[PDB]
């Protein structure tokens, strides 16, 4: 099965799915030009085979990105819950880009960095910026906008509802 990972520069889409594979977060950050990871998952007591595909965040990739569409079964969308302007580039980059190429591949719409969500560190910094964290709520319904199959909120260091990402991932495939 093919996954392609897609959203904004620097919201956490390589370390989900190294802390996914490796159970290991990189302690240091390196912007991906292209990946290619792999997993081998049972679910649905079915032996699964899933190909991960990591991009770029940047629009200095942007007509460069769109090749690892083609004969993918399932897109996820990623934004960080504390980071407002990855939310707005979802409907406004991301489902674009992706509905343009593919217009039936189904998408998962995903909240990266759900631990920082609760921090009072960030929400105290957040402020300054008069903005608040996206709530459930609010992705619940950005996700019915951009026509996502499933809506999910993880945190790629606590590997909190990790699991879960892929697991409908798969599920929405078969
Ligand atoms: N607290 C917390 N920090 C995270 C989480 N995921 C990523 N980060 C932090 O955010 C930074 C970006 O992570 P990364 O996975 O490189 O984003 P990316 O979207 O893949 O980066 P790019 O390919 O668009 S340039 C890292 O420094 C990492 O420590 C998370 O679940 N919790
Ligand atoms: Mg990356």
């Known amino acids: 099965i093919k996954c392609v990972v897609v959203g904004d520069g620097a919201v956490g889409k390589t370390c989900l799915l190294i802390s996914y594979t490796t159970n290991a977060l990189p302690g240091e950050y390196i ?4 990946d290619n990871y792999s997993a081998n998952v049972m679910v649905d007591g079915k032996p699964v085979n899933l190909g991960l595909w990591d991009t770029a965040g940047q629009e200095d990739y942007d007509r460069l990105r769109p090749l690892s569409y083609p004969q993918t079964d399932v897109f996820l969308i990623c934004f960080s ?5 990855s939310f707005e ?3 406004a980059k991301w489902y674009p880009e992706v509905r343009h190429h593919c217009p039936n591949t189904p998408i998962i719409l995903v909240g990266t960095k759900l631990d920082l969500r609760d921090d009072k560190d960030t929400i105290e910094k957040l402020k300054e910026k008069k903005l608040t964290p996206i709530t459930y709520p609010q992705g ?3 996700a019915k906008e951009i026509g996502a199959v499933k809506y999910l909120e993880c945190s790629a260091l606590t590997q909190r509802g990790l699991k ?3 697991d409908e991932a ?3 495939v078969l």
Do not use: C, E, G, K
Not at 31 to 34: A, E, K, L
Not at 81 to 85: F, H, I, N
């Open 89 to 91: 580039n979802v409907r």
């Open 31 to 34: 912007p991906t030009v292209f």
């Open 81 to 85: 819950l504390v980071s407002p302007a």
């Open 164 to 166: 879960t990402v892929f």
């Open 170 to 172: 798969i599920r929405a």
């Open 140 to 142: 619940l319904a950005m």
